[PDB]
């Protein structure tokens, strides 16, 4: 086997000194310093633990040079909240506001008496 | 290759070489020697020959 | 870290500007995420609600009792502990409570407190069983553990 | 580098202002036209020899047509 060496002056196996093996056109194995693994966004509901879909998982500063479409979904709260918890909040907003109408009428028929 | 003042940066080195030798330079590299003198590698433009520029400078 | 009692991250609405305020309560045993808690004079008796001791009944027990009116919680904060409301008197705005140590103390009727015991149960019931587990317990608190006679 | 699939979209990149040169490389089974633009090097691959013969004479004037052999 042919053994390898670091190509930079950081000689420790730190979290930013991660490498991978690559075979050059010159038929030798060298290190290629990898980028860190990015994560998809979590959901703003803070309940369901899965990460969002339709959004590229990159490092945060990579998102500056990405297109807008790659960073969000075509929906209300798209790219910030999951589809499942958006359906729940749409129903919750409607039903509670209906409940407000219920108690407003309920006291309106209560105030028919002195 | 020149020996330049230690305070001179690449912008000043390029401008100095451009005016007092009447040549156009592409890029300038710069290191400081172990004796403390700054040394500049001044690559000339492709339409300027370094050989005949060095002739009239006087370092043939 | 360094505490037996868990902490609750409650989110209120700021009443004067558009903002969300994040408090850090001491979790009372029984409260859960996605639960509404109510703080004020008009809050009613429920576990986790923060209402003054002067408007409480004469036998209710509290979690994070204020020592003085106005400050934030200072009493019965360690896990599993609680105070008990013993008596009030509408004159001179005073209320007598029983501290976790058994001492009776007179505080103002405006002092606020969470309702219920504080979570963390009988943590001291489990034997530590190991010098190493005592090492880890005190590494989160301070440099006091290996005690030379 | 960018790969160009068909012919006519290679022509306007060839006649683009930032096109420095065109390189024609002959292989055993195809001919590659490589126009060196400012950012990329656009390679168009034609497997038919006579098609590359016609395209070679159809290049815009005033551009380098350097052949690699």
């Amino acid at each position: 086997v042919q053994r390898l060496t670091y190509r930079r002056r950081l000689s420790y196996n730190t979290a930013s000194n991660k490498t991978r093996l690559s075979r050059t056109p010159g038929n030798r194995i060298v290190y290629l310093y990898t980028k860190k693994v990015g994560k998809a966004p979590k959901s703003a509901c803070g309940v369901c633990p899965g990460r969002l879909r339709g959004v590229r998982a990159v490092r945060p500063k990579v998102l500056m040079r990405l297109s807008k479409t790659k960073k969000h979904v075509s929906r209300a709260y798209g790219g910030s909240m999951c589809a499942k918890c958006v359906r729940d909040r749409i129903k919750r907003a409607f039903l509670i506001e209906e409940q407000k109408i219920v108690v407003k009428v309920l006291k309106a028929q209560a105030q028919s008496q002195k | 290759v020149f020996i330049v003042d230690v305070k001179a940066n690449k912008h000043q080195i390029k401008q100095a070489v451009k005016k007092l030798y009447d040549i156009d330079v592409a890029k300038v590299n710069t290191l400081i020697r172990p004796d403390g003198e700054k040394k500049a590698y001044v690559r000339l433009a492709p339409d300027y020959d370094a050989l005949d520029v060095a002739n009239k400078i006087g370092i043939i | 870290p360094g505490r037996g009692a868990p902490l609750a991250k409650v989110v209120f609405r700021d009443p004067y500007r558009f903002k969300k305020r994040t408090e850090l309560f001491i979790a009372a045993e029984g409260i859960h995420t996605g639960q509404f808690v109510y703080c004020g004079k008009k809050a009613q008796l429920n576990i986790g609600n923060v209402l003054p001791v002067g408007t409480m009944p004469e036998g209710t027990i509290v979690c994070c009792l204020e020592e003085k009116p106005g400050d934030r919680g200072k009493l019965a904060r360690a896990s599993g502990n609680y105070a008990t409301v013993i008596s009030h008197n509408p004159e001179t705005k005073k209320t007598r409570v029983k501290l976790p140590s058994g001492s009776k103390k007179v505080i103002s009727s405006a002092n606020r407190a969470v309702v219920g015991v504080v979570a963390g149960g009988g943590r001291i019931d489990k034997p530590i069983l190991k010098a190493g587990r005592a090492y880890h317990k005190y590494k989160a608190k301070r440099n006091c553990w290996p005690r030379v006679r | 580098p960018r790969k160009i699939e068909e012919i006519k979209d290679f022509l306007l990149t060839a006649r683009r202002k930032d096109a420095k040169s065109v390189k024609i490389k002959k292989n055993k089974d195809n001919v590659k036209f490589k126009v060196r633009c400012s950012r990329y090097l656009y390679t168009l691959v034609i497997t038919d020899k006579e098609k590359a013969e016609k395209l070679k004479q159809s290049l815009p004037p005033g551009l380098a047509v350097k052949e690699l052999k």
């Binding site: 002056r9 | 400081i32 020697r33 172990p34 004796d35 403390g36 | - | -």
Partner: protein
């Protein structure tokens, strides 16, 4: 080390330049009384101050 500051490198440059023998023509000066460079320093025999 390989990583050095400008002030350290500039200091090492001066100590390098003054670690050279006396010129031969010095000994021919009238009233010279100097034989060699007595302030010579080898990198192994004695270490620098810093």
């Amino acid at each position: 080390s390989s990583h050095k500051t400008f002030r350290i490198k500039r200091f090492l440059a001066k100590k390098q330049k003054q670690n050279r023998p006396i010129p031969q023509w010095i000994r021919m000066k009238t009233g010279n009384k100097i034989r060699y460079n007595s302030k010579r320093r080898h990198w192994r025999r004695t270490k620098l101050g810093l």
